[PDB]
Amino acid sequence: SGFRKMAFPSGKVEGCMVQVTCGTTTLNGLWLDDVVYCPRHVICTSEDMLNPNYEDLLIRKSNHNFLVQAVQLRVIGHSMQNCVLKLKVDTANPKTPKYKFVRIQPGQTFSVLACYNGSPSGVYQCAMRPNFTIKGSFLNGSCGSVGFNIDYDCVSFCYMHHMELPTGVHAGTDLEGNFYGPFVDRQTAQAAGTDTTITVNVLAWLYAAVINGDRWFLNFTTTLNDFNLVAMKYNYEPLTQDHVDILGPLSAQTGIAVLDMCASLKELLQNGMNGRTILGSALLEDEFTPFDVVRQCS
Amino acid sequence: SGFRKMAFPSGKVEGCMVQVTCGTTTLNGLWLDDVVYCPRHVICTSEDMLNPNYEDLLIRKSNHNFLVQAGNVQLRVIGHSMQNCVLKLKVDTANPKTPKYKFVRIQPGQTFSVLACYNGSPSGVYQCAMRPNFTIKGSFLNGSCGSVGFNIDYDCVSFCYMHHMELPTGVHAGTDLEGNFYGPFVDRQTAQAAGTDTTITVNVLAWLYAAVINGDRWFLNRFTTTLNDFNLVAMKYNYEPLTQDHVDILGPLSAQTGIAVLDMCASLKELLQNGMNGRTILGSALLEDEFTPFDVVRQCS
Ligand SMILES: CNC(=O)Cn1c(=O)nc(Nc2ccc(OC(F)F)cc2C)n(Cc2cc(F)c(F)c(F)c2)c1=O
Ligand SMILES: CNC(=O)Cn1c(=O)nc(Nc2ccc(OC(F)F)cc2C)n(Cc2cc(F)c(F)c(F)c2)c1=O
């Protein structure tokens, strides 16, 4: 019993984390086979951070301007792919796990290994929000910390951290260096956009609560279109049939149909929680996917 | 910035996790140097698990009755012994991946990371607090017995919890690494249940400081208080007493924020007396007590 926000075990990723130094700029890098992946912001200096020309900044450096440590790696090739740098090194990481690069979709979750100076400090779970931010915990030096999921022995890397926006949320890229959302790697004013709640995830969590003995919030039914109207009023993402489909195995296990759980959610939205808690939380929680629930509950 | 329940990176502990099997009973063990540590419950068969005679079950065993598997590697057991509620299995191989480590027995209020494991295979990591009633609010299914809790300091792992059982309210009870249970619980079926719990007061104040450092300020009021007057309020709200030692522990956060500990106490006082009025603090609608002052410093420095 019990339900908690749980990260994947970080050992496979820990052995991949390096420090990347270019002149007087340092951050975190990801060493896999004979290649170190890191954010291209590593080539800027204090002066450059406001509107850097990365192409032009990069030309002013060769293979030997980049210091990789985790020991020492000798850099023998460099290239910029989108917003990340690929540094070919002479040594294949003997600690390289089976891995894949994947671009996740909004509302999916992953584990973050928060790192500083190439050294792992902590691990936590979070969601790619609908507005393509994450609500992490990062301080200066955490650039290049990565997010991932694990499938038995394979690590799917989906996120590399770049920056904190003025609002205190975080943005970054896939491991091919394309930002999630409309963000750019420069210190300018950047609007995140409306942060909507991941409806399918909130429903999953309500299933998790029923599996764990929290049932006071059950009852009425509703309709998709009727529920979706309430969704928009409360800045919840619209609920589609594919979402109803993804929730099938939890519905099946609990004997609670999706639309009955929606009608339960309507009352919570329209009426609040009347001072009660669900899985020890006094608000609706949207960072567990249906898969997350199933995994933890079996 | 931002604030999250954050576990320690688990790799150092992952490499110590093994599977221990005795007949058809299996669970997790911890392999450090040439010793494997696990719950003694593993020597029970189904028919013994209700009211076991551990001394009796143990004497009937030899080394070869214990199968220890570290991933694919079959270890060979060359000694066995029982210490309180754990078993200690001497094996012929020292664990090449043994971190620098210590065993520590923690106080109520302190937090640790749990690596939840099944069949000696790690499945997830999350943070927990030892509750004042000596349970933890974890996430554990059957087969998690022997999973460990720990803290890490530089390269040194401090092991503080080995998981044994789930109580009927769905909370969790276990031992330190010398095998002595936290709280009054026993490794057998009895009428045992979790006491009434209280809130870890010094942790709430640390988390309020954390909120301040992240830009939450609405709860900061014009009042101050005394330690005496504050403790009267705490008692009413089933909060643990705040001691002058606690005040001293909170010194650093006070120095970083420039809010005197007694001024923060008066803020908490108002929060307890009037509730939060539907506002949030660090994305929470309740007062959180599972961050230590250490946890806060770690994450806001
Ligand atoms: C709260 N902070 C964060 O979430 C992450 N973050 C960070 O870690 N570092 C930043 N700038 C910086 C400063 C110094 C430095 O090296 C020096 F110590 F030698 C190296 C770097 C990368 N930034 C700001 C940032 C702004 C951007 F526009 C970016 F594109 C970017 F990658 C980072 C962080 O946000
Ligand atoms: C929700 N469950 C838990 O948190 C932990 N838990 C557990 O993982 N296993 C249990 N019993 C069991 C069953 C079969 C078995 O071998 C077989 F699987 F091959 C091995 C074991 C240990 N128990 C019950 C328990 C009761 C006690 F009195 C204990 F002392 C104890 F250590 C475990 C769990 O609670």
Numbering used by the authors:
A (entry chain A): 1 to 70, 73 to 221, 223 to 301
B (entry chain B): 1 to 301
Question: Which statements did the authors publish about this structure?
Answer:
Nsp5, also known as 3C-like protease (3CLpro) or the main protease, is a cysteine protease responsible for cleaving 11 distinct sites of the polyproteins to transform into mature functional proteins. 3CLpro is a cysteine protease with a Cys145-His41 catalytic dyad in its active site, which recognizes P1 Gln and P2 Leu/Met/Phe/Val as its substrates. 3CLpro plays a critical role in viral replication, and its inhibition prevents the formation of replication-essential enzymes, such as RNA-dependent RNA polymerase, thus inhibiting viral replication. Thus, 3CLpro is an attractive target for small-molecule oral therapeutics for treating COVID-19.
Further profiling of hit compounds revealed that one of the hit compounds, 1, could be a potential lead for this project because it displayed potent enzymatic inhibitory activity and favorable PK profiles with oral bioavailability. An enzymatic inhibition assay revealed that the IC50 value of 1 was 8.6 μM, and the in vitro metabolic stabilities of 1, measured after 30 min of incubation in human and rat microsomes, were 97% and 71%, respectively. We resolved the X-ray complex structure of 1 with the protease. As expected, the binding mode of 1 in the X-ray structure was similar to that obtained in the docking. The S1 and S2 pockets were filled with the methyl-amide and 3,4,5-trifluorobenzene moieties, respectively. The 4-difluoromethoxy-2-methylbenzene subunit was placed in the S1′ pocket. The 2-carbonyl oxygen of the center triazine moiety formed a hydrogen bond with the main-chain NH of Glu166. The other side of the 4-carbonyl oxygen was bound in the oxyanion hole of the protease, which formed two hydrogen bonds with the main-chain NHs of Gly143 and Cys145. The methyl-amide moiety was placed in the S1 pocket, of which the carbonyl oxygen interacted with the side-chain NH of His163. The protease exhibited an interesting conformational change in the S2 pocket; the side chain of the catalytic His41 was rotated and formed a face-to-face π interaction with the 3,4,5-trifluorobenzene moiety of 1, whereas the docking pose predicted an edge-to-face π interaction.
